[PDB]
Amino acid sequence: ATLEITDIALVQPSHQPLSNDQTLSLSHLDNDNNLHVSFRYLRVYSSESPSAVVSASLATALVHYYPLAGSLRRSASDNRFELLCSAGQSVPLVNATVNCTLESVGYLDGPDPGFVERLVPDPTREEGMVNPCILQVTMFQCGGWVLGASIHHAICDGLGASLFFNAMAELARGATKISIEPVWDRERLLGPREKPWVGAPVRDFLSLDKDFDPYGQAIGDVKRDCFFVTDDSLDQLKAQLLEKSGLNFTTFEALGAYIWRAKVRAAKTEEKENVKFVYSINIRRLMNPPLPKGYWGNGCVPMYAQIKAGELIEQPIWKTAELIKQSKSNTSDEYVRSFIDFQELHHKDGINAGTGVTGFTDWRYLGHSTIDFGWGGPVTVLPLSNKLLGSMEPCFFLPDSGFKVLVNLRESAMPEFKEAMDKFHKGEFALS
Amino acid sequence: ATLEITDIALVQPSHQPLSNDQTLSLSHLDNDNNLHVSFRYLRVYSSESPSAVVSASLATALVHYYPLAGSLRRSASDNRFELLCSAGQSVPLVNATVNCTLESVGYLDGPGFVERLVPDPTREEGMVNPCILQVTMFQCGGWVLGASIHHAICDGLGASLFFNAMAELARGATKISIEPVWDRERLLGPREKPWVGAPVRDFLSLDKDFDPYGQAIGDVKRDCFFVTDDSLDQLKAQLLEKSGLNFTTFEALGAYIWRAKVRAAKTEEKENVKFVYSINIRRLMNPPLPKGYWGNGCVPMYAQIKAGELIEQPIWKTAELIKQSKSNTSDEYVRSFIDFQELHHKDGINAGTGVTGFTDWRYLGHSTIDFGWGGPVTVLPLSNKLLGSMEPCFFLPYSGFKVLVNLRESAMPEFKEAMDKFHKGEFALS
Numbered sequence: 026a027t028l029e030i031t032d033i034a035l036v037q038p039s040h041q042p043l044s045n046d047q048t049l050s051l052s053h054l055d056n057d058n059n060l061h062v063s064f065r066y067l068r069v070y071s072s073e074s075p076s077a078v079v080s081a082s083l084a085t086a087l088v089h090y091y092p093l094a095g096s097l098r099r100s101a102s103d104n105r106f107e108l109l110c111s112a113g114q115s116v117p118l119v120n121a122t123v124n125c126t127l128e129s130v131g132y133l134d135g136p137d138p139g140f141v142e143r144l145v146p147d148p149t150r151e152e153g154m155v156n157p158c159i160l161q162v163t164m165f166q167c168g169g170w171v172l173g174a175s176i177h178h179a180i181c182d183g184l185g186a187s188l189f190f191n192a193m194a195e196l197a198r199g200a201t202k203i204s205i206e207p208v209w210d211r212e213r214l215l216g217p218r219e220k221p222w223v224g225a226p227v228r229d230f231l232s233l234d235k236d237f238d239p240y241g242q243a244i245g246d247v248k249r250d251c252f253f254v255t256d257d258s259l260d261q262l263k264a265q266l267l268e269k270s271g272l273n274f275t276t277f278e279a280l281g282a283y284i285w286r287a288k289v290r291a292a293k294t295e296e297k298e299n300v301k302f303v304y305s306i307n308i309r310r311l312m313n314p315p316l317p318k319g320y321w322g323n324g325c326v327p328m329y330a331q332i333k334a335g336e337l338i339e340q341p342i343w344k345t346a347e348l349i350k351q352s353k354s355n356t357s358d359e360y361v362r363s364f365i366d367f368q369e370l371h372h373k374d375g376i377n378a379g380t381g382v383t384g385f386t387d388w389r390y391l392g393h394s395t396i397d398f399g400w401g402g403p404v405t406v407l408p409l410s411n412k413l414l415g416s417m418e419p420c421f422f423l424p425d426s427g428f429k430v431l432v433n434l435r436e437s438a439m440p441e442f443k444e445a446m447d448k449f450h451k452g453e454f455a456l457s
Numbered sequence: 458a459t460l461e462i463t464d465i466a467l468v469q470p471s472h473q474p475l476s477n478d479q480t481l482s483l484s485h486l487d488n489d490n491n492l493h494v495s496f497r498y499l500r501v502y503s504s505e506s507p508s509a510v511v512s513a514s515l516a517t518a519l520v521h522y523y524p525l526a527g528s529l530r531r532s533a534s535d536n537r538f539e540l541l542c543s544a545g546q547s548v549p550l551v552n553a554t555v556n557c558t559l560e561s562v563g564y565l566d567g568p569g570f571v572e573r574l575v576p577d578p579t580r581e582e583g584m585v586n587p588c589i590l591q592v593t594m595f596q597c598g599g600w601v602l603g604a605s606i607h608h609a610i611c612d613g614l615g616a617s618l619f620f621n622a623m624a625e626l627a628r629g630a631t632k633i634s635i636e637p638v639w640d641r642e643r644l645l646g647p648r649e650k651p652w653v654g655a656p657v658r659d660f661l662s663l664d665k666d667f668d669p670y671g672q673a674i675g676d677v678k679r680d681c682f683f684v685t686d687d688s689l690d691q692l693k694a695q696l697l698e699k700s701g702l703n704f705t706t707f708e709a710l711g712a713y714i715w716r717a718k719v720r721a722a723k724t725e726e727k728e729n730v731k732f733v734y735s736i737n738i739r740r741l742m743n744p745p746l747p748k749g750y751w752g753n754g755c756v757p758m759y760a761q762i763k764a765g766e767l768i769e770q771p772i773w774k775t776a777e778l779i780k781q782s783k784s785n786t787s788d789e790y791v792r793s794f795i796d797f798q799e800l801h802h803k804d805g806i807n808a809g810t811g812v813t814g815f816t817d818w819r820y821l822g823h824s825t826i827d828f829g830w831g832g833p834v835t836v837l838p839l840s841n842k843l844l845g846s847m848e849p850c851f852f853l854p855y856s857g858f859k860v861l862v863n864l865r866e867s868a869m870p871e872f873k874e875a876m877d878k879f880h881k882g883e884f885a886l887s
């Protein structure tokens with residue numbers, strides 16, 4: 026089963042919004058170094074044709090979201106990114122065609138059949154500055170298709186890319202005007218204070234080292250593995266944790282704790298290596314003043330819980346989950362402004378969180394269904410980037426009743442983790 | 458506070474009535490552009506779990522109420538919305554929790570996590586998922602039912618028939634008592650020769666690129682005010698001893714609020730402003746609409762005046778203007794309102810700027826929606842886009858009563874002051 030690029034149309038906006046070269050600068054969250062990647066993910070649709078439908082809504086959306094056709098480039102003074110927009114810039118659209126039906130591969134929900142990685146362009150992050158937003162429409166012989174997207178993480182976070190794709194989707198459904206107007210103005214809203222000040226909750230977590238590439242660690246060839254998890258086992262687990270800890274845990278707390286411990290123990294981490302649990306959270310509604318409705322840049326700070334690997338692999342789950350619960354306490358206006366002010370002081374010092382960072386990303390209850398171009402919402406959605414949140418092994422929560430846990434793991438540790446998930450799938454949680 | 462979403466159950470109909478996919482046409486009342494919005498409200502209950510009971514009665518209801526599963530699309534021949542119904546479609550039921558006791562949060566009267574108690578889709582997103590229910594549990598055994606419904610599919614009394622049919626099944630009804638009737642393009646269709654009377658022509662205008670819900674007035678805040686039967690009596694009686702006329706609460710209080718609203722917004726003296734509300738016309742048509750008809754069976758009634766005259770003329774004149782607005786409610790008024798939609802849907806029908814809408818929820822049987830935990834103790838609307846207005850106002854039921862007003866940020870400081878003089882009995886009636 027072989028995929029085949031046919032041709033690559035270069036869609037400019039419908040009616041040009043730019044006269045001359047506007048150069049937009051990016052916020053101090055956009056210039057995070059862990060965001061100097063390209064996020065690759067795809068959506069699968071079942072059931073006038075998808076190519077022209079996507080390229081039409083894209084052309085019209087690019088009157089408002091015109092910076093997605095820009096060119097990222099580093100700056101003369103600071104090493105920060107700035108985005109170059111002009112008239113004639115285009116977002117490439119790849120058309121592809123794989124010679125099987127997608128029902129034969131289970132709508133790509135199960136194991137990889139070989140070509141999933143070619144279902145969205147894979148630029149190494151420097152050709153991902155020239156074209157920081159790339160779309161692809163692969164057509165299957167079934168009567169069904171896939172929509173891949175390679176967007177540079179500095180331009181937009183998850184919710185920002187959601188606004189853009191909801192704009193394309195509604196336009197394809199006959200909407201007369203985009204429901205929410207994009208707002209840029211990122212150096213105003215998310216900028217550093219005049220006297221930069223950083224509090225303990227940020228300093229206790231970040232370190233400086235110009236020589237540390239968080240994505241360059243030699244931990245081996247990393248693999249992608251999905252796992253189904255039922256609402257039955259979660260309630261089984263939340264209740265046992267309740268009998269012991271006297272506290273009620275969210276799914277993200279309790280399932281995050283169990284996966285963290287199973288990951289660090291399977292990777293045989295030294296008993297006294299500092300390890301970290303890291304996740305993004307939206308702060309748009311939390312700044313004072315709150316961020317505007319159409320802010321589509323990065324509006325998320327990373328939050329952390331840290332511990333020794335020895336303590337993690339041996340202490341009860343309900344102390345680890347309690348630790349993860351204590352981490353979302355730090356979320357505040359001062360945390361974000363301290364994080365921004367730390368970027369202003371040490372952006373060229375190589376900010377990082379260290380080794381043994383495991384990233385967790387909850388995507389279950391994004392509005393995936395409303396990304397509808399006329400073939401229904403996506404049957405399945407899949408992220409491919411294993412470089413995320415300063416981590417090389419990021420874990421995704423994805424949409425007989427439960428959700429899909431996607432983990433990225435070093436090949437050396439996948440066998441024991443597959444086992445630790447089967448014990449979960451059997452209620453043998455070994456809480457201590 | 459902390460609200461978690463635990464799962465989302467996609468509840469399909471029990472005995473799936475569709476083999477063929479079915480496109481259902483909506484009526485010209487349904488396709489009023491002022492109804493292309495998602496209406497969000499919640500019910501709070503007190504004292505075989507509410508999640509399981511609601512979903513079980515939801516599924517059986519959807520055998521007769523299957524259009525609530527389908528999608529809203531713009532037809533090929535025109536912009537007009539058609540309802541795509543097919544086998545396999547479902548209604549999402551978000552399941553959620555919060556670590557409060559419901560009594561801890563002053564149930565839900567005293568006014569901060571309510572905007573999460575129900576999803577908030579945009580108007581286009583709302584066409585993909587028109588009917589979204591959400592059951593949220595609180596510690597001290599009690600729960601909240603959230604609903605986001607696209608207004609093109611049904612009106613107030615229409616979501617009442619659907620929920621009362623959910624309520625009667627959850628109690629143990631063997632079948633549903635009233636079959637729901639569609640028959641929509643036949644019942645509320647246009648006349649072969651469209652004719653539009655002056656009572657409708659004087660209220661609306663044509664403008665392709667006017668958006669009633671995208672006006673640039675700033676950000677709209679939401680606030681409640683308790684209004685006593687004490688002060689209303691003193692208001693109707695001082696209007697009586699000054700005009701000799703009798704005024705209902707909806708005419709006297711709605712005129713005090715309309716005036717204070719327009720006062721606070723610093724509206725230019727010669728701008729036309731409007732007072733709007735909907736009335737059920739099911740019993741007013743010749744022939745009447747069936748009892749099961751659950752689509753939109755209401756037309757907006759309007760009352761208009763210059764801003765400067767409204768802000769300085771006596772209250773009893775403004776309350777008379779509203780009293781006289783219900784004179785226009787007839788059968789031809791509805792047939793004219795429909796024929797106007799037939800003539801000018803593509804030309805952007807609207808009632809212009811300055812529109813303050815009002816909705817009166819006090820005297821509608823909110824109790825009978827009983828799933829097993831009694832009637833809802835409180836009920837709260839969350840939308841602020843309604844009846845072509847971005848600053849709607851609600852009269853909430855008897856637990857005096859609470860008036861819920863949506864008003865732009867900059868006008869709220871003087872509206873609080875206005876309502877504070879209403880509470881003291883300083884009505885300043887001219």
Ligand SMILES: O=c1ccc2ccc(O)cc2o1
Pocket residue numbers: 496606607608611612613614616816
């Ligand atoms: O104005 C209203 C009041 C209640 C209501 C309830 C459901 C609905 O779909 C629309 C509605 O509009």
Ligand SMILES: [Ca+2]
Pocket residue numbers: 228229230231232
């Ligand atoms: Ca440090």
Ligand SMILES: [Ca+2]
Pocket residue numbers: 769887
């Ligand atoms: Ca006066």
